[PDB]
Structures are given as C-alpha cells and as structure tokens.
C-alpha cells in the first residue's frame, strides 16, 4: 500500500540506483543495522555512543543508556530481535549488553569478558553467540540470568543458518570453515569442516533460504558457494559457484551482502585507496551489473532494507551515513481518474459513431488484511514501536 | 476477447485471448505475437504477480483489461 | 483501388478543372474538356487525398471520407441507383460540406447510413422510416430527388432579399447597397507541376438563415430499395441562391451564382466500405416505376451550359 | 567459430586493431592483454559523447547531416570538451558567435 | 478557446554596418582570404628554403585554414586589450602587447 | 591499389546507435577520424611515459587508467574510467 497504487514499473526496480540522503553523525559511525523492518537505524558511534535514528525523519529518537550502563568505546556489533523489542550490542569494552527497548534508560542485561569483541548474534528463548578477539572458540550466552558457556587458527566471524537455526557456521583465521550442530544446550559437536584458502576469512553471509553462501577472503577474492543441508542436520556439502574480484586494480573488500530471499544480487564495498564505490553483481551468471557511485570516501559497512528497499553505508574518513534508495517520480497521470500519460505521439482510430452526435452486490471484505505487497515483503509481522521519552522534550 | 499488455518501453499490445485460457497460454500468445520467450518475461496485474501454474480466469480477468509486462532483465 | 498522384484536389475552398487547347478563344487560350471519358464519372478534383478509386473506397484504416457527383441538381425530378467494420453512407450534400466529413455531419448535407438505413443530418441520426429492412452487399438503392421550378426558388430568394434589405438591418450602408437568373463565374488559369487547371472560389459555412425555416417549395427526397420506397428522407430542403461565397469583404470595402448551386449526390466511404453510383438509363433498373430523365442528361446539359457561358464570357 | 574480441566486451571500436597499434607503435616492450580493451572503450566513449552533441546541434539547426560546423559548435559550447581540445583547430568550423558588451549600442 | 500554434538617400550611422558584418561573419564558416594570392604567397615564401617545390594542392589549403584560425584568434585577444585601455579602436600597440603577453615575442 | 585504414565504419556504427537517423558528412568523418587518432596518441604516449618512470616493462590496464585520469578533464575522467572498467570486466568474464 502506496505501492499497490503505484505503477509496477518504477516500483519494481531490482536495487537502489541513486543516493538521496546523507546523515551526518557528530561522532564517527562504526556499525549499521536496520530494525527487522525498515523502521529504525541503530547506529554505533565512535565512543560507545549508541543512537537509534528513525527512517521517517532521519533524526534521533532514542539514545539507550542515557541513565547509565552505556558504552564507552567503539562498538562492534548491533543485532536486533526478530520482533523488534530487544536489542543486543557489543563493543571493544569487552561487554555484551542486551537492552529492552521498552525501558531504554539503562541496560536490561549485560555480561563482561577478557578480550574485545568481533560480533554477537541472536538466537530466539534468549541466547546469543559471540566471537571474541584472538580466541579459537565461540561463546553461547543464554543470559536470562547471565550464564555463559563455550563450545585451525582462530575464529573471526560466526553466523547461524537461516532455515535450520541449530546449524552454526564459523570462519577461521587460517582458511577453515567449521560447522556446528546446536543439538544441545551447551555441548556442540562439529558436523563438517574444510579449508578453502590460506588467508583469513572476514565475512560469512547466507541468503534467507539457505540456498547460497558467500565468503570474503583476505586474498582479494569473493568465494560464492551454493550450500545445502539435509539428513536431520547431518548432510552438508558445498559447491563452488563463483569467484569475484577487481580485475583493474585488485582492491580489497570491506563488507558484503546479499539480496532478500533468492539472493539474486551481491553487494560489496571496496577497501583500497581511491575506492569510493559499491559493486553489485548477479549471482547466477556472476557478471557485474551495477556500481553505486555516490560517496567520496572509503566505505566500511553496508546494510540493505527490503521493505523500503534502501542501501545504507557509513563513510570512513568523515563518519557520515549515505543512503541509496529507489526513487519514484510523481506522475501527473494521477491528478484525474482518466489521465493516461504517453511518451510518444500515439495515433488515433475512430469508429463511424464519433462523427454522429448522440443491485451491485460485489464481494466486499473490510476486516481482512493483505499478507504480501508487490515486492514480496511479509506484512502483519509484529512491529514493536520504541516508546517516545517526553523528559528530554520539554527543554 | 482483447486484453492489454503494457510494456515499460511505452508499447501496449492488444492480445486476443479467452477467459478459459491458462496464463501459460497467455505467455505463449505474447511470444507468438512478439517473439519474447515466456521464460524471460514477468506479468503483473493489480499489484499481484500472476502465479506460474494457475489460469487467467483465476484472476477474474475480463475483456479490455490492462496489465503490465516487466522483463526479468539480465546481461 | 488507386490514388491520385499529381492532381490538385479540392481544398481551402478552391475548385480545379482540366482544360484543353481551344484556338477560337483569343483572350483565353483554353476551353473546358468534356471529361477524361464520354459519360459522367467520379469527379477527381473534389475528392479527399485519402479517397481511392465508377468505383470509390478508402483503405480499411481511414475515417469517413466522401466524394460528390459532378452534376449539380438544381431543380426538377432526377432518379438514379447507387450500387453497393466496413461502413458506407449514401446521400446528397451541398458544396459547403467538407470532403473530410461524413455526409450529414453539417447542416448543408443530408444522408443515410448503410447499417439500419438511418437518416443523418446536422450530425444527428433519425429513424423516420419504420420498415427497418437491413441492406445487404448487393442491394441497389434508388434516389428520386424532386426540387421546385427555378422561378419559385427565385421568388423565395427575392423574398429573402426583401426581408434582408431592411427588416434584418433595421458599414451598414454598404451592406444595404448590396443577379439571380444571370450567372457570373470566376475562373483563373493556373499551371501546377506542368499540368493545367482552372482555379475557382468556393462557398463558406455561415449562420443558418432563418425567418418558419427556409424550405424549397415542394422539395422532396425519396429513397427506394429494390423498387420498394422507404419514405421521404427530407422535405424542407434549404434554398441556395443562402450560400455566400468566400469573400474578402475587407478588401472591397477598403477600396470601395456560378451555375453550380444545388445539391450533389454524395457517396461516403468508411474503413473500406466501397460502392458505385449509376447515371445512365441503359444501366438504370427502376426507371419506369416512377410512372423522367437520368443524371447523364443533366451532365450533358451542364456541359452545354458551361461551354456556352464560356463562349459569351470571352467578350 | 571465431568471435571478434571487440564483441565480447560490448564495444563497437576494434580491439584487435588497437592492440596491433599499441604493439607496433613502440610505446612499450610489452602490452597487457586488457589494455587495448580499456583504451578502445575510452575511445568509443569520447567519440559517442562528442557525436551526441554534434547530432543535437545538427538537429537544432534543422539539418540531418553532421558537418564540421556542428562539431565546432558541440565542442566549443561544452566546458570540458573545450579543455580536451583547447589547442586544436577544426577545419571549416568557423567560430562561436560572441560580441563584447562595451560594443553593443546603448 | 482555440487551437494554439507556432505560425498563422539612406545612410546607416557609423558603427552599425560593422555590428552587422560581425554577426554575419561569426556565423559563416568559409575562408576569408582569396585563394590565388595565398597560393602565390606560400610559393614565394618557400623559395628561401628550397628552390623548386611542388606544393600538393591539399598542402596550400591546409596552411590557409591555420593562417585564418591564427589571425582571427589573435584579433580576439587584441580586442580585449583595446577594451582594457578604455577605447574601442584596436591599435598596433595592442597587437604587440597581445603577442608579448601570449609568449610570441618575450 | 594499396588499402589504407581508418575508423570510418566504427564511427558510423556509433553514430547509428546514438542518433539512429542522422548521417555524417565526409569532412566531418575525416575530422572525427583524426580526433580519434590524436586522442589515441595522447593517451598511449602518456601511458608509456608513466610505465617508464616506474621502471615497469609493460603498459597494462592501469597505466591506461591513470593516463585517462590525468589527461581528461574533471568529469570526463570519471565517466571514461567507468566505461573502461565496465568493458574490461565484461571482457575478462567471457
């Protein structure tokens, strides 16, 4: 709705094409993460400042930890909860802080460690999976009462499979993919491992339907596989699908991302000097199709939102946040019920008549809702609203 | 009966069909009129993508209706 | 069906006519041709550019277009037959009607439709006849057109003059200062792409003249299909003595009949609907049920009147 | 079957020709295998960018044949195509209409 | 309301025929020097270098093109110098200043 | 007769895709041909000079990019380098 009424030509573009807005953050941004729906943008600033902008205004709506317990130094991970209520974050202050966004003055729960953090990830229940700096094992923190448990070089990035939330994937600092089966609470045996490179894996992304996977090596290449699982979470194989790279100047990659469900597009951000653009390839054929060309600085992070269908990325030198969104132009054709606009001179055919001058009971359902829009995004999902705080409004 | 297929490029084609024809028959008709293989196209009506297996009459399409043909473009 | 390629067609209120070298004329050098043939036929000068060709049609994608008969029916009783998505129209129209518009779209022409035989005038349809017999692909439609004697039309025109001189006027004085039997024609010789045609001024649409509506005395339009009449199409036929030529009145104020006034049998073609009109008694099929002269007679009469007036107007 | 090297990249300008010119023009001892492709892409981009303005001029002048005057107009009316060709002179291109303001009557 | 459309003795004071010749020459694109005098001038200048050359007929023409596109451009610059000195005439001390600033004399 | 070469047919194939109905003259075709030759020589000469300072022994797809970015003005440089890298990618993956 606002899309059903729109014409299905300028609304069904496959990816953003131009940048529209450029948020300026007073601190320096380090992590971006939309809400489960395209409602809120949870930014992690330079010095542990954590803001939540709103996409309807681009101006802040809530700064968690304003009372106490806030973060003090660069944040490294921001993971939302599928409903929208809870929000997990982790910084270089070794602490993992889960916030209930119904009382955002103070952290709801938090745990502390003995090393900086790379990333935290949600599971439901309430249990997160974390990767610690320089360590060689992940951590399962099922902190409804704050317990912590543990589970080829090191472990850098972790990610849970989308279709089978018992499967867990992890990449090593030496080239090994290692898979885990969360068949228990705090005892997990591997189900598969392998070594595809000689360099550090830096990112592990997976499509929403477990039918694809991508990997960013420290070598200037991107390895894209077509994973598949079966056999009560035992059958697991990988088939090399493609390898992407920069043929001209062999630049390195900073972050990668897929499309929504079938992952028909792969978006990557380059890292070297003179690198200001985002590449967008297909995945079936693997040929380059687009280059986002908006910013003027090395771009670190990427995030895609499929409801509003926007790409968001934070600069490195400045600290701003640029947004490339699909743009729909206003059609004068709407101003009347029969105003059809054309592009070229149409010819006119006339019947012999034109020169010669001179109950209902249709099905109506008002209480039924629509499940999917034109793009294919699932409505009716619970969209928790951050409560407005009035105390900071009177001044 | 006539239905319309509006292509992005500005062209509208006036296909002749029967309500008992399947959508697959409609894609075949768009091909045999314009030569576009049914696999490469994508048909849209009233905000809902017409599903591959079902029939024209499933969507209550009657004569002189218009509907939008977008291409699943590639390299 | 073929189109004309190098003929000046009637447009912008100008009429053309071919001529042939006549050495009896000294002031003028040429006199009117009989025709490209013996008998009367389709007048090629007043056709639409899109009107293709006794046979006429338009392609199947073309709007209403018309052709007129060459002979101008002034008075008397004339009968003929027109032989028949593709529609057509049969009727009669004055010169003011446009060749681009279907007969009966204006107030200067009266026509009938192919489907349902409805009568068309002023752009409005009529179903005066209750017979409602459909017309097939091989039917022959007769037309008997009866018009009053010239003298009564002349006196009706004189009545119009006597009203107009002061009753409708009470530069007025010039208008008040402003020949009914006498014909005065205007013709200039022109050469268009090495071909030779005569240019003559034509009439323009103006406000309808009113007083009771002007009607030709005992004027009647009768229509027959295969011997059976289908009624009288019209009675109150407009007088034309009423017919102002295109005139730059500004010019003559600043300085200070052409024998072709009447109703022409007109054939209209739409989306390929063809037909043909019959002129000569030998190929006339219902000439005796009236009891009379065919159109071809008036064709010869017009030829004679034109050549004699050409003779006299030399001096 | 053969497949022209300039058709695998969506170009119109020849790539084998540009490669032979780079090889036998004595620019360097060795020519990378993708240098001719890049150079031919840049060449056709520039020539299309100038031919487009030349056609726009020849159309806004009610002709249908690009002619040296139209190229001179297309170049000197731009702002960046003017610096790329600041030294050249286009034969039969005339000059751009311009009259100072101190000279126009009052 | 109606259908819109696109269509439906003497002595000029000194300084006006000039402003008309300027507009009629800044839009034309032909050569402004007779061809036989320039032919002979080129042939006569090339005596001081080699006695009997043959000057292929496209060489001469070529020179003429440049020889215009130089002088014309020169005059433009000199014009500014004149306008700079708060006058309208162009004097020989303007051409010399243009050629000096521009680098041709130093 | 000896066959000399030019860029006539390629300039024509580009004209017939930028303006599908216009047609070039003869002198204008020779002008476009000499323009292409001149820009070719500029770019290749700068690329050589640049692949000499660095003591490399080859003139690769990056010497050409830096040459294009030096010689071409402000905005023509970005579009030129984009078209170039697009063509090189579309060519290498085929």
From Swiss-Prot, chain A:
Could you confirm whether the keyword Cytoplasm appears in this record? no
Which biological processes are named by the entry's GO terms?
Answer: regulation of DNA-templated transcription; subtelomeric heterochromatin formation; telomere maintenance
In the UniProt record, which is one GO cellular component term?
Answer: nucleus
Disulfide linkage? none
Kindly state which keywords UniProt assigns to this record, in alphabetical order. Chromosome, Nucleus, Repeat, Telomere, WD repeat
What's the domain of life for this entry? Eukaryota
Binding of DNA occurs at 220, 250
Instruction: Supply the InterPro entries for this chain.
Output: RBBP5/Swd1, WD40/YVTN_repeat-like_dom_sf, WD40_repeat_CS, WD40_repeat_dom_sf, WD40_rpt
Cellular localization per UniProt? Nucleus; Chromosome, Telomere
| Pfam families hit by this protein | WD40
Could you tell me which residues the WD repeats occupy? 24-63, 70-109, 196-235, 248-291, 294-334
Q: Which Gene3D superfamilies match?
A: YVTN repeat-like/Quinoprotein amine dehydrogenase
Looking up SMART domains in the UniProt record yields:
WD40
Phenotype upon changing residue 250 to A: Decreases H3K4 di- and trimethylation
- Outline the subunit composition: Component of the Set1C/COMPASS complex which consists of SET1(2), BRE2(2), SPP1(2), SDC1(1), SHG1(1), SWD1(1), SWD2(1), and SWD3(1).
Q: What else is known?
A: Present with 907 molecules/cell in log phase SD medium.
PANTHER family in the record: RETINOBLASTOMA-BINDING PROTEIN 5
State what this protein does: Component of the Set1C/COMPASS complex that specifically mono-, di- and trimethylates histone H3 to form H3K4me1/2/3, which subsequently plays a role in telomere length maintenance and transcription elongation regulation. COMPASS recognizes ubiquitinated H2B on one face of the nucleosome which stimulates the methylation of H3 on the opposing face. SWD1/CPS50 acts as an assembly and regulatory hub for COMPASS complex formation. Serves as a highly utilized surface for COMPASS interaction with the nucleosome.
Q: What is this protein called?
A: COMPASS component SWD1
Give the originating organism.
Saccharomyces cerevisiae (strain ATCC 204508 / S288c)
From Swiss-Prot, chain B:
Q: Where in the cell is it found?
A: Cytoplasm; Nucleus; Mitochondrion outer membrane
Site annotation (Essential for function) points to 68
What residues bear Phosphoserine in this entry?
Answer: 65
Q: What is the effect of changing residue 66 to A?
A: Abolishes CteC-catalyzed ADP-ribosylation
Cross-link annotation Glycyl lysine isopeptide (Lys-Gly) (interchain with G-Cter in ubiquitin), location:
6, 11, 27, 29, 33, 48, 63
The listed outcome for residue 65 to A is: Prevents phosphorylation in case of mitophagy. Decreased localization of PRKN to mitochondria
Give the result of residue 74 to G, as annotated.
No effect on ADP-ribosylation
Describe the processing and modification events after translation: Phosphorylated at Ser-65 by PINK1 during mitophagy. Phosphorylated ubiquitin specifically binds and activates parkin (PRKN), triggering mitophagy. Phosphorylation does not affect E1-mediated E2 charging of ubiquitin but affects discharging of E2 enzymes to form polyubiquitin chains. It also affects deubiquitination by deubiquitinase enzymes such as USP30. Mono-ADP-ribosylated at the C-terminus by PARP9, a component of the PPAR9-DTX3L complex. ADP-ribosylation requires processing by E1 and E2 enzymes and prevents ubiquitin conjugation to substrates such as histones.
- List residues modified as (Microbial infection) ADP-ribosylthreonine: 66
Domain Ubiquitin-like stretches: 1-75
Coiled-coil intervals in this record?
A: none
Membrane topology is: Peripheral membrane protein
Q: What is the effect of changing residue 42 to E?
A: Impairs ubiquitination by CRL2(KLHDC3) E3 ligase complex. Impairs ubiquitination by CRL2(KLHDC3) E3 ligase complex
Q: Where is this site: Interacts with activating enzyme?
A: 54, 72
Give the superkingdom in one word.
Answer: Eukaryota
Outcome reported for the amino acid change (mutating residue 63 to R): Abolishes HLTF-mediated polyubiquitination of PCNA
Q: In its UniProt entry, what is this protein called?
A: Ubiquitin
Q: Which species? A: Homo sapiens (Human)
- Lineage of the source organism? Eukaryota, Metazoa, Chordata, Craniata, Vertebrata
The gene it comes from is UBC
Swiss-Prot record, chain E:
Q: Which residues carry this modification: 5-glutamyl serotonin?
A: 5
**Positions of modified residues (Citrulline):** 2, 8
In-chain residues carrying the UniProt-annotated modification N6,N6,N6-trimethyllysine: 4, 27, 50
Asked if the record carries the keyword Flavoprotein, the reply is no
Q: Where is the protein situated, by its record's location annotation? A: Nucleus; Chromosome
Q: Which residues carry this modification: N6,N6-dimethyllysine?
A: 4, 50
Q: Which residues carry this modification: N6-(2-hydroxyisobutyryl)lysine?
A: 4, 27, 35, 50, 93
Can you provide one Gene Ontology molecular function annotated for this UniProt record?
Answer: DNA binding
Q: Which family does it belong to?
A: Belongs to the histone H3 family.
Under the heading PANTHER family, the entry gives: HISTONE H3 (PTHR11426)
SUBUNIT field: The nucleosome is a histone octamer containing two molecules each of H2A, H2B, H3 and H4 assembled in one H3-H4 heterotetramer and two H2A-H2B heterodimers. The octamer wraps approximately 147 bp of DNA.
Q: Which protein are we looking at?
A: Histone H3.2
Q: Which organism is it from?
A: Xenopus laevis (African clawed frog)
From Swiss-Prot, chain F:
Where in or outside the cell is it found?
Nucleus; Chromosome
Q: Where is this cross-link: Glycyl lysine isopeptide (Lys-Gly) (interchain with G-Cter in ubiquitin)?
A: 90
Gene Ontology CC: one annotated term: nucleosome
Q: Name one GO molecular function term.
A: DNA binding
Q: What is its main location?
A: nucleus
The residues that carry sugar chains are 82
For this UniProt record, the keywords arranged alphabetically read as follows:
Acetylation, Chromosome, DNA-binding, Glycoprotein, Isopeptide bond, Nucleosome core, Nucleus, Phosphoprotein, Ubl conjugation
Q: What modifications follow translation?
A: It fluctuates in response to extracellular glucose, and associates with transcribed genes.
Binding partners and assembly? The nucleosome is a histone octamer containing two molecules each of H2A, H2B, H3 and H4 assembled in one H3-H4 heterotetramer and two H2A-H2B heterodimers. The octamer wraps approximately 147 bp of DNA.
What is the annotated role of this protein in its UniProt record? Core component of nucleosome. Nucleosomes wrap and compact DNA into chromatin, limiting DNA accessibility to the cellular machineries which require DNA as a template. Histones thereby play a central role in transcription regulation, DNA repair, DNA replication and chromosomal stability. DNA accessibility is regulated via a complex set of post-translational modifications of histones, also called histone code, and nucleosome remodeling.
Q: Which family, according to the similarity comment?
A: Belongs to the histone H2B family.
Q: What's the name of the protein?
A: Histone H2B 1.1
């Amino acid at each position: 709705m606002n899309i059903l009424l729109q014409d299905p030509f300028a609304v069904l573009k496959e990816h953003p094409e131009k940048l529209t807005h450029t948020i300026e953050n007073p601190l320096r941004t380090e992590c971006l993460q939309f809400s489960p729906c395209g409602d809120y943008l949870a930014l992690g600033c330079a010095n542990g400042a954590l803001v939540i902008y709103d996409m309807d205004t681009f101006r802040p709506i809530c700064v968690p930890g304003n009372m106490l317990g806030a973060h003090v130094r660069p944040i490294t991970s921001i993971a939302w909860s599928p409903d929208g209520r809870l929000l997990l974050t982790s910084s270089r202050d070794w602490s993992i802080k889960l916030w209930d966004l119904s009382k955002p003055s103070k952290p709801l729960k938090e745990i502390r460690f003995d090393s900086p953090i790379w990333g935290c990830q949600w599971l439901d229940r309430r249990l997160c999976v974390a990767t610690i700096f320089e360590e060689s094992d992940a951590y399962v923190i099922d902190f409804s009462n704050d317990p912590v448990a543990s589970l080829h070089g090191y472990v850098l990035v972790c990610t849970v499979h989308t279709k089978h939330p018992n499967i867990i994937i992890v990449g090593t600092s030496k080239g090994w993919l290692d898979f885990y089966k969360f068949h228990s609470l705090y005892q997990t045996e591997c189900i598969h491992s392998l070594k595809i490179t000689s360099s550090n894996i830096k990112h592990l992304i997976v499509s929403q339907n477990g039918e694809r996977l991508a990997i960013n090596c420290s070598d200037r290449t991107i390895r894209q596989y077509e994973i598949s699982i079966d056999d009560e979470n035992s059958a697991v194989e990988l088939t090399l699908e493609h390898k992407y790279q920069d043929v001209i100047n062999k630049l390195q990659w900073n972050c990668i991302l897929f499309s929504n469900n079938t992952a028909e597009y792969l978006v990557a951000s380059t890292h070297g000097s003179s690198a200001h653009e985002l590449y967008i390839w297909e995945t079936t054929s693997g040929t380059l199709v687009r280059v986002l060309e908006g910013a003027e600085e090395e771009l670190i992070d990427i995030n895609w939102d499929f409801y509003s269908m926007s790409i968001v990325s934070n600069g490195f030198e400045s600290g701003n946040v640029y947004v490339w969104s699909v743009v729909i132009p206003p059609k004068w054709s709407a101003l009347a019920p029969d105003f059809e606009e054309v592009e070229e001179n149409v010819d006119y055919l006339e019947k012999e008549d034109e020169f010669d001058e001179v109950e209902e009971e249709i099905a109506i359902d008002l209480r039924t809702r629509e499940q999917y829009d034109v793009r294919g995004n699932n409505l009716l999902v619970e969209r928790f609203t951050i409560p407005t705080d009035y105390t900071r409004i009177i001044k | 009966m006539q239905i319309f297929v509006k292509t992005l490029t500005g062209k509208t084609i006036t296909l002749e069909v029967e309500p008992s024809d399947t959508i697959e028959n409609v894609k075949a008709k768009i091909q045999d009129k314009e030569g576009i293989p049914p696999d490469q196209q994508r048909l849209i009506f009233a905000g809902k993508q017409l599903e591959d297996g079902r029939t024209l009459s499933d969507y209550n399409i009657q004569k002189e209706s218009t509907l939008h043909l977008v291409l699943r473009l590639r390299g | 069906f073929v189109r004309t390629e190098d003929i000046p067609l009637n447009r912008r209120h100008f009429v053309y006519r071919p001529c042939s070298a006549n050495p009896f004329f000294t002031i003028l050098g040429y006199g009117c041709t009989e025709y490209p043939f013996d008998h009367s036929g389709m007048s090629v000068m007043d056709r639409s550019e899109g009107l293709s060709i006794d046979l006429v049609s338009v392609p199947d994608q073309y709007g209403w277009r018309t052709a007129r008969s060459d002979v101008c029916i002034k008075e008397g009783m004339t009968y003929w037959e027109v032989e028949v998505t593709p529609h057509l129209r049969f009727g009669v129209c004055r010169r003011e009607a446009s060749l681009e518009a279907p007969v009966g779209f204006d107030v200067y022409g009266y026509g009938i439709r192919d489907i349902s035989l409805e009568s068309i005038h002023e752009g409005k349809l009529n179903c005066v006849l209750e017979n409602g017999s459909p017309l097939k692909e091989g039917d022959k439609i007769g037309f008997l057109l009866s018009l009053p004697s010239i003298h009564t039309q002349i006196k009706q025109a004189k009545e119009f003059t006597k009203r107009r001189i002061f009753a409708l006027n009470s530069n007025k004085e010039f208008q008040r200062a402003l020949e009914y039997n006498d014909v005065v024609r205007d013709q200039i010789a022109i050469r268009y792409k090495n071909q030779l045609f005569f240019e003559a001024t034509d009439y323009v649409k103006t406000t309808k003249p009113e007083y009771d509506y002007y009607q030709l005395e005992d004027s009647y339009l009768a229509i027959f299909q295969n011997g059976k009449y289908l009624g009288k199409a019209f009675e109150n036929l407009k007088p034309l003595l009423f017919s102002e030529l295109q005139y730059n009145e500004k010019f003559y104020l600043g300085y200070w009949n052409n024998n072709k006034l009447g109703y022409y049998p007109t054939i209209s073609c739409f989306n390929g609907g063809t037909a043909r009109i019959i002129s000569e008694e030998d190929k006339l099929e219902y000439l005796d049920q009236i009891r009379v002269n065919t159109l071809d007679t008036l064709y010869k009469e017009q030829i004679a009147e034109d050549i004699v007036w050409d003779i006299i107007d030399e001096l | 079957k053969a497949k022209t090297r300039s058709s695998r990249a969506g170009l119109q300008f020849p790539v084998g020709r540009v490669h032979r010119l780079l090889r036998k023009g004595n620019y360097a001892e060795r020519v990378g295998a993708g240098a001719p492709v890049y150079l031919a892409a840049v060449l056709e981009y520039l020539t299309a960018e100038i031919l487009e303005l030349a056609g726009n001029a020849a159309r806004d002048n009610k002709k249908t044949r690009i002619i040296p005057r139209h190229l001179q107009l297309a170049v000197r009316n731009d702002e960046e195509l003017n610096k790329l060709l600041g030294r050249v002179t286009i034969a039969q291109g005339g000059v751009l209409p311009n009259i100072q303001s101190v000279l126009l009557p009052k | 309301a109606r259908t819109l459309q696109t269509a439906r003795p003497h002595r000029y004071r000194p300084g006006t025929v000039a402003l008309r010749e300027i507009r009629r020459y800044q839009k034309s694109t032909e050569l402004l020097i007779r061809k036989l005098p320039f032919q002979r001038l080129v042939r006569e200048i090339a005596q001081d270098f080699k006695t009997d050359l043959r000057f292929q007929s496209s060489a001469v023409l070529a020179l003429q093109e440049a020889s215009e596109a130089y002088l014309v451009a020169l005059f433009e610059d000199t014009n500014l110098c004149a306008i700079h000195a708060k006058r309208v005439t162009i004097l020989p001390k303007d051409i010399q200043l243009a050629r000096r600033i521009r680098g041709e004399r130093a | 007769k000896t066959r000399k070469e030019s860029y006539a047919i390629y300039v024509y194939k580009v004209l017939k895709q930028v303006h599908p109905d216009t047609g070039i003259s003869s002198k204008a075709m020779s002008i476009m041909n000499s323009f292409v030759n001149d820009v070719f020589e500029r770019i290749a000469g700068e690329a050589s000079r640049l692949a000499h300072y660095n003591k490399r022994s080859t003139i690769t797809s990056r010497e050409i990019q830096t040459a294009v970015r030096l010689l071409l003005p402000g905005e023509l440089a970005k579009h030129a380098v984009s078209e170039g890298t697009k063509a090189v990618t579309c060519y290498t993956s085929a």
